[PDB]
Design a protein around this ligand. Structure first.
Ligand SMILES: C[C@]12CC[C@@H]3c4ccc(O)cc4CC[C@H]3[C@@H]1CC[C@@H]2O
Ligand SMILES: C[C@]12CC[C@@H]3c4ccc(O)cc4CC[C@H]3[C@@H]1CC[C@@H]2O
Lengths: 93, 233, 233, 93
């Protein structure tokens, strides 16, 4: 591939999520992870992960709630434009 | 083409759905406001928003039908204008302050932490107020955004020029639908388009400020923002 | 007020009469084109035009009814935009080159004598062509000029805002009078106002260029121009 | 006064004019003189004179023609705005 794929939740506590994805075959400057309570509609949180990594923890989630998680691969303007819709998933904590 | 078959109601619905997600800033109150820390804060927010700006753009009707070279160009040109028009929209209901984000409500003195900032702030405020004062509606606003994206730059592109005249018709349709007379219609159309000028201007002043901050080497900027800036000189 | 009682025909006649005089440049062919000499040439022309710009402005309806402080502000803001829109008008019938003056017809390579110039030239050309391509009429043009003068800047002025909506009505009246349909009317209105954005932008880029040329100390600039520039930082 | 006045032609040859005016009571950065054939409608010529001066020669005029001459006092933006319409005259060479 050429953009991140196979995003999924590896482990989980009531308050934390550890996630992983299969990196794209490309220099990735870094990633952005965004999460938010699913269809809650509020602003989402976002944080950055170094491009050599391909997993991230998410913490301080409200136990038993359903979050939407989305992983953004930050490359360059051109690739990002050319690139596909980012992969996202839903996971209830 | 498909962006041309869309009725105004359809056109507006599309843009209304393509809206980027609202973002929290990295504001932290254990560390006090320094020139370094606030620029880092604003500058971090900007990098964030840019990532969504890209995917928002693609969803703007007819945009993804341009050569990738043109899609790039429009964005290298428009990003700060887009950023600004959003801030100014977001701040309309806050006479006096700028709602950079749900957790970042700055007002005018907070800006003169950073040298060069306050002048741009004053304008962002003035413009904000002007929109509030003419009761800009969310439906007009998304149109403005798009025009800003599509109108950035120069000629060497008549594709771009049709989908703009579309957006214009949409605009005019809204006003009509909102109970204006023909003369009040064209008048308000003109009033909004004149404002776009002020944003180009604010955008230019900001961009130079941002550039001077990169050199002075106050704060470090992320790879993406860094590109959007260097795209300008 | 008086600028408001004027019918469109009256309004257009007034602006058409207030036109500044056409000026020769100080071009001399015994001395070859250096970066120094061409900047001095353009920069000398600019100082000249500015003296007439002042007295042209006063003749623009309702302008002389503003506080002197506002008359000053509008001009410190607008002078290069005004300068440019004029150049771009003046060049319409010269695909490829810029008619800075009756004795100065520059084209694109002549501009890359001066570093930084060529980029602005390319835009002045693009804009020029765009006007020619949509057959901008002298009557629309004087309106544009005025809007540019009146629209420059920011809010803290509803006087200014009426005499603009006047000019808008005048504009719309012309098109009507010229055989357009309602939809072609608003469309063309929008097309012109969008162009004003490109000029703000060209104006900003120029102003910075001009400023970098002052420092590098290539050419010396006259007291008046010097003020109009420093008015900006 | 506060802007130039009493503009007039002192001497004249077939091709040259020497003109003078009563200066205003003020620092004048410099003056601009413009001349053109009267109601010919063409572009006008223009040249600069140091503000300590209050006379100027004009040369290379077409003999027997009627010119319009106008003297501009360059001060500052504010004065120039506040100031009056510039004084002009017609003189046939
Ligand atoms: C680009 C600047 C930092 C990022 C700022 C920002 C950051 C986020 C956003 O949504 C809008 C804006 C507009 C003003 C921008 C600023 C103006 C000058 C400064 O350099
Ligand atoms: C201001 C500059 C010199 C004067 C130029 C001028 C000079 C006279 C004029 O009528 C128009 C213009 C537009 C472009 C201006 C130039 C753009 C950059 C340069 O510094």
């Amino acid at each position: 591939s050429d953009v991140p794929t196979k995003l999924e939740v590896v482990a989980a506590t009531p308050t934390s999520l550890l996630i992983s994805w299969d990196a794209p075959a490309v220099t990735v400057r870094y990633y952005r992870i965004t999460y938010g309570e699913t269809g809650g509609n509020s602003p989402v949180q976002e944080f950055t992960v170094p491009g050599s990594k391909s997993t991230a923890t998410i913490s301080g989630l409200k136990p038993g709630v359903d979050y939407t998680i989305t992983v953004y691969a930050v490359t360059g303007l051109r690739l990002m434009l050319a690139g596909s819709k980012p992969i996202s998933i839903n996971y209830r904590t | 083409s498909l962006a041309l078959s869309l009725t105004a109601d359809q056109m507006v619905s599309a843009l209304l759905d393509a809206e980027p997600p609202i973002l929290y800033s990295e504001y932290d109150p254990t560390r006090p406001f320094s020139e370094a820390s606030m620029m880092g804060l604003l500058t971090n927010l900007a990098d964030r928003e840019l990532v969504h700006m890209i995917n928002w753009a693609k969803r703007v009707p007819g945009f993804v039908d341009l050569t990738l070279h043109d899609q790039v160009h429009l964005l290298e040109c428009a990003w700060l204008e887009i950023l600004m028009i959003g801030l100014v929209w977001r701040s309309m209901e806050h006479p006096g302050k700028l709602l950079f984000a749900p957790n970042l409500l700055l007002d005018r003195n907070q800006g003169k932490c950073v040298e060069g900032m306050v002048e741009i702030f004053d304008m962002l405020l003035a413009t904000s107020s002007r929109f509030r004062m003419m009761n800009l509606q969310g439906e007009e606003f998304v149109c403005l955004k798009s025009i800003i994206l599509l109108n950035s730059g120069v000629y060497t592109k008549d594709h771009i020029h049709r989908v703009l005249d579309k957006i214009t018709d949409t605009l005019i349709h809204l006003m009509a639908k909102a109970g204006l007379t023909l003369q009040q219609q064209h008048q308000r159309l003109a009033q909004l388009l004149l404002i776009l000028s002020h944003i180009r201007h604010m955008s230019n002043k900001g961009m130079e400020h941002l550039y001077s901050m990169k050199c002075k080497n106050v704060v470090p900027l992320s790879d993406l923002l860094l590109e959007m800036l260097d795209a300008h000189r």
